[PDB]
From a paper:
The [name]-2 β-lactamase is an enzyme that efficiently hydrolyses carbapenems, the most potent β-lactam antibiotics, active against the broadest range of Gram-positive and Gram-negative bacteria of any β-lactam class. In Gram-negative bacteria (such as E. coli), which are leading causes of antibiotic-resistant infections worldwide, the primary mechanism of β-lactam resistance is the expression of β-lactamases, enzymes that hydrolyse the β-lactam ring to abolish antibacterial activity. Our search identified [name]-59 as containing a single mutation within the α2–β4 loop (glycine to aspartate substitution at position 89 ([name]) compared to the parent [name]-2 enzyme); but kinetic characterizations of [name]-59 are so far unreported. Experimental kinetic, biophysical and structural characterisation of the naturally occurring, but previously biochemically uncharacterised, [name]-2G89D mutant with several antibiotics and inhibitors reveals significant changes in hydrolytic spectrum, specifically reducing activity towards carbapenems without effecting major structural or stability changes.
To test this prediction, the [name]-2G89D mutant was generated and purified from recombinant E. coli. Circular dichroism (CD) spectroscopy thermal melting experiments on the purified mutant protein indicated that the mutation does not adversely affect global stability, conferring a slight (1.1 °C) increase in melting temperature (Tm). Strikingly, steady-state kinetic measurements reveal significant changes to the hydrolytic profile of [name]-2G89D, compared to that of wild-type [name]-2. Notably, while [name]-2 has strong carbapenemase activity, the [name] mutation results in a 100-fold decrease in catalytic efficiency (kcat/KM) towards meropenem and a 10-fold decrease for imipenem. The participation of the α2–β4 loop in the dynamical networks in [name]-2 indicates strongly correlated behaviour between this distal region of the protein and the active site, despite these being relatively far apart (26.3 Å distance between the Cα atoms of the catalytic Ser70 and Gly89 in the α2–β4 loop). The differences in calculated residue networks indicate that a glycine to aspartate substitution at position 89 affects the intramolecular communication network within [name]-2.
Author numbering: 24 to 57, 59 to 252, 254 to 294
The structure:
Amino acid sequence: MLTNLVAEPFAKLEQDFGGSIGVYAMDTGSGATVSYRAEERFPLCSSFKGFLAAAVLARSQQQADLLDTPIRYGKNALVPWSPISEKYLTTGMTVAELSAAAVQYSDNAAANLLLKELGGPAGLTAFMRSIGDTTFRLDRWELELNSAIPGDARDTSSPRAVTESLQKLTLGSALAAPQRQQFVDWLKGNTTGNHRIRAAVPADWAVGDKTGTCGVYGTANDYAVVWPTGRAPIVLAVYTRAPNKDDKHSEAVIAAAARLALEGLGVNG
């Protein structure tokens, strides 16, 4: 009834891109939604790292000393693209610092260290089940989880489930209030998403996001919570993939899909 009240040209956009685009956007005020391929599975790539940080924050509600716990690691823990943790190899970092690095720099060593704390891919999946997400699955570690193989459900979710879980964790009651705001603040501080959903969001609105880029199969994504001034926040997810292993991803297509989602919701930008 409130889904796709206004049609938008997502099909032309994905055809120009040469792949598939999945979009689910929720106006948390009215409950109106924009939905395009929203229940298809797409690879998470680095976007799981946002949910990883939320799972750590959930654990910190029962373990008050968790976030400030200092974690030492060896050179064997460094994974390609670990821009923060490589600078602290000789000192260690706290759990909170590793969480911020995973969210805000997509730091791979930090992500694997935090996965270990939670009991691996199955432990993160269990956390997502605990907030009512039956779609999300993490199966592998960095970097193997980026293979983005067509038809492979490992390490995937849907745009809809991503948006629904993001809403629960940033605006709903899945986290206690202090942890909720810390999750929001980490997302707001992301550095990797300036050319994705943020490029469609006016500079005078608050926004937090987490990107994903698999490096193959034109596969990349972003999810965000957006606070337009004077109205309720919007939660949205934009995922892409393409049929050929060497197909390139496009940041511009993600930004364009976000613009169409905001237009479909009647959110003036």
